[PDB]
């Protein structure tokens, strides 16, 4: 059911002021763009996603997008009544999944025949809405009915809607924020030394075939667990049969504990087709991150006039609700029509991946 | 008008069954052990910390000790009623500053003449306790009027209060821990990681010219935020002028934003005493924290009969509130005399470092019965 595309830009100006020639990045889109281009729902995505928010691109897919339970024919995201069309951004997580097409570190350098590495231009937030904006204005398209989107997804989202206010009617920001607020860009940074302790790492310049994959497998352990909760470890860890006292991190300062061992394995598994260096571009643009990209929160939540959803997850331990309701009575205190829901579940942050449904029908009163 | 001294033991077996020749830790003591030695309060110290919970060394120094607000004359530890004794962990992580003792990873095998690296055996926090003990024990100590500690202070306070009942009268455990969950141990590991990532690790057997500065440096920073709480980091921010996009982080990708820098410098800061391969130890020590140290917590409290006083902090991010509710809602169910007051402050798990005074009283009061 779902083709993956393609979208091409010979040239484009970062947000920082820099040229990226020849940007490729790719994208799909579900349900059918109606006469006006008046149903368009812009999904976004999280960090370490891509376009795949919802459907298959071969039957035998072990699992459809991550926002399939929500996005479809019916559903509280109605693909019967909006062409849901979802991009991949630039230096994308998944630089090397056969699905996933990107433009960035790994993107050769035809001055050099060789992986642009850092050499790579900064791209934030806005680079990733303004190549959507390239996308949807090159399929005619010159207005949002809704932009959707979760964690980094709502970064983008929220952006959407200041940056472009005539653009947006809607924005549902989930598991979400408005800034990326020094406690954020902070802890965000620790995603990214691990890879730049990693020796393979060689400022970047490293080969395919001598990456540094213990820092990617580092930074993602550590992604992994803030996009969790306690509950979550603790419940896995008891599947694992965790004990405080294991003998082999006992014996040996170099084996770990049961949990260890498996957020490791994990991680590594979900690291095979990723890219070192992509995480660092993308930890850096939600670094960056204010909606509208202005002076600061107040003067970026002052462009909305689309009606704003804000769905953090109570549980949140990386994006923390406080973030959600600092955007959301900022808009109230403006006379924005805003609303806040809540997602709470058990694992955290990707309540509002895996579980975005449980809040399906605000989604849903949302975009009648 | 705080010495600093040492204690020493030949032979120590370590509770992973090896051997350490020539333990060396540092010690301090406040008051006066009365005639019975029946007022002595035992300080254990928290996982970056030392024995110094109090007073000064040098009348120049520039702080006291981390918890001289509650410890002293006429304080909530009265320091002229107990006699309070502290001694530097096994592994300590500040294997350079001038005041600590400790033996690990740093200290010179004398088997071989050269350092142990990762050589030196698994520490647990049983390994810190005992040493306590055997200190305790030379100086002819038999029972302890409360132990307290925060955060891995109180993994030893719990301890010490689970693996010796008679021992121990009262425990206070401040911002801490029944037992170190897979949540916990999981989070500690990102503490380690980026040290033995750090090419010049060398898999342990760096020279202390050679160490992983830039590894090490990692660490402190995971764990300076893993501390603190986002009202920190934001009113520090904005005592930094801090913005979301900031023109050196947005030019370059080696650049990096107003708090990352922050973060970093007070980061190589903390690490100049530090050692790289003590932090993998006392991360190691963290993970196979349970009270008691049996196959589980329950296991670890059945056994506690001290009277036991919870101090987590609300807004603690590190060692969350339900650590301590856990402890204190098992214990509870086993009659055991159990209190529980909160820190409600914004500095997060550093409430009970910094900040402990703000229960001064409940500490006083069950203290003082």
Same mark, same amino acid.
């Given at each position: +059911?779902?083709?993956?595309?393609?979208?091409?830009?010979?040239?484009? &100006? =970062?947000?920082? *002021?820099?040229?990226?020639?020849?940007?490729?990045? *790719?994208?799909?889109?579900? *349900?059918?763009?109606?006469?006006?281009?008046?149903? !368009?729902?812009?999904?976004? @995505?999280?960090?370490? /996603?891509?376009?795949?928010?919802?459907?298959?691109?071969?039957?035998?897919?072990?699992?459809?997008?991550?926002?399939?339970?929500?996005?479809?024919?019916?559903?509280?995201?109605?693909?019967?009544?909006?062409? %849901?069309?979802? %991009?991949?951004?630039?230096?994308?997580?998944?630089?090397?999944?056969?699905?996933?097409? &990107?433009?960035?570190?790994? $993107?050769?350098?035809?001055?050099?025949?060789?992986?642009?590495?850092?050499?790579?231009? !900064?791209?934030?937030?806005?680079?990733? %809405?303004?190549?959507?904006?390239?996308?949807?204005?090159?399929?005619?398209?010159?207005?949002?009915?809704?932009?959707? /989107?979760?964690?980094?997804?709502?970064?983008?989202?929220?952006?959407?809607?200041?940056?472009?206010?005539?653009?947006?009617?809607? +924005?549902?920001?989930?598991?979400?924020?408005?800034?990326?607020?020094?406690?954020?860009?902070?802890?965000?940074?620790?995603?990214?030394?691990?890879?730049?302790?990693?020796?393979?790492?060689?400022?970047?310049?490293?080969?395919?075939?001598?990456?540094?994959?213990?820092?990617?497998?580092?930074?993602?352990?550590?992604?992994?667990?803030?996009?969790?909760?306690?509950?979550?470890?603790?419940? &896995? *860890?008891? &599947?694992?049969?965790?004990?405080?006292?294991?003998?082999?991190?006992?014996?040996?300062?170099?084996?770990?504990? $049961?949990?260890?061992?498996?957020?490791?394995?994990?991680?590594?598994?979900?690291?095979?087709?990723?890219?070192?260096? @992509?995480?660092?571009?993308?930890?850096?643009?939600? #670094?960056?991150? %204010?909606?509208? @990209?202005? /002076?600061?929160?107040?003067?970026?939540?002052?462009?909305?006039?689309?009606?704003?959803?804000?769905?953090?997850?109570? =549980?949140?331990?990386?994006?923390?609700?406080?973030?959600?309701?600092?955007?959301? #009575?900022?808009?109230? $205190? +403006?006379?924005?029509? $805003? =609303?806040?829901?809540?997602?709470?579940?058990?694992?955290?942050?990707?309540?509002?991946?895996?579980?975005?449904?449980?809040?399906?029908?605000?989604?849903?009163?949302?975009?009648?």
């Amino acid at each position: +059911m779902v083709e993956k595309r393609v979208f091409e830009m010979p040239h484009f &100006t =970062t947000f920082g *002021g820099k040229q990226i020639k020849n940007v490729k990045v *790719g994208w799909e889109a579900y *349900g059918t763009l109606n006469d006006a281009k008046s149903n !368009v729902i812009l999904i976004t @995505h999280y960090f370490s /996603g891509s376009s795949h928010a919802a459907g298959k691109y071969d039957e035998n897919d072990p699992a459809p997008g991550y926002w399939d339970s929500i996005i479809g024919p019916g559903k509280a995201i109605d693909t019967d009544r909006f062409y %849901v069309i979802s %991009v991949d951004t630039l230096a994308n997580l998944n630089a090397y999944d056969p699905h996933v097409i &990107t433009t960035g570190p790994t $993107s050769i350098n035809p001055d050099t025949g060789k992986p642009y590495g850092l050499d790579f231009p !900064v791209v934030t937030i806005r680079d990733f %809405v303004n190549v959507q904006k390239a996308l949807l204005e090159s399929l005619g398209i010159s207005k949002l009915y809704a932009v959707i /989107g979760p964690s980094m997804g709502s970064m983008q989202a929220i952006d959407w809607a200041s940056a472009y206010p005539g653009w947006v009617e809607r +924005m549902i920001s989930v598991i979400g924020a408005g800034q990326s607020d020094a406690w954020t860009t902070a802890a965000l940074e620790h995603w990214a030394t691990p890879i730049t302790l990693d020796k393979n790492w060689n400022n970047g310049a490293y080969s395919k075939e001598q990456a540094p994959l213990n820092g990617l497998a580092a930074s993602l352990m550590l992604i992994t667990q803030n996009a969790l909760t306690p509950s979550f470890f603790n419940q &896995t *860890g008891n &599947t694992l049969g965790y004990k405080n006292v294991e003998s082999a991190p006992l014996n040996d300062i170099r084996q770990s504990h $049961s949990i260890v061992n498996w957020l490791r394995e994990r991680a590594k598994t979900r690291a095979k087709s990723m890219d070192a260096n @992509h995480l660092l571009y993308l930890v850096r643009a939600c #670094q960056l991150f %204010v909606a509208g @990209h202005q /002076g600061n929160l107040e003067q970026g939540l002052a462009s909305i006039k689309a009606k704003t959803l804000f769905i953090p997850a109570q =549980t949140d331990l990386l994006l923390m609700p406080y973030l959600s309701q600092s955007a959301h #009575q900022g808009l109230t $205190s +403006m006379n924005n029509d $805003s =609303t806040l829901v809540t997602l709470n579940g058990k694992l955290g942050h990707l309540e509002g991946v895996t579980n975005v449904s449980a809040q399906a029908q605000a989604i849903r009163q949302f975009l009648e």
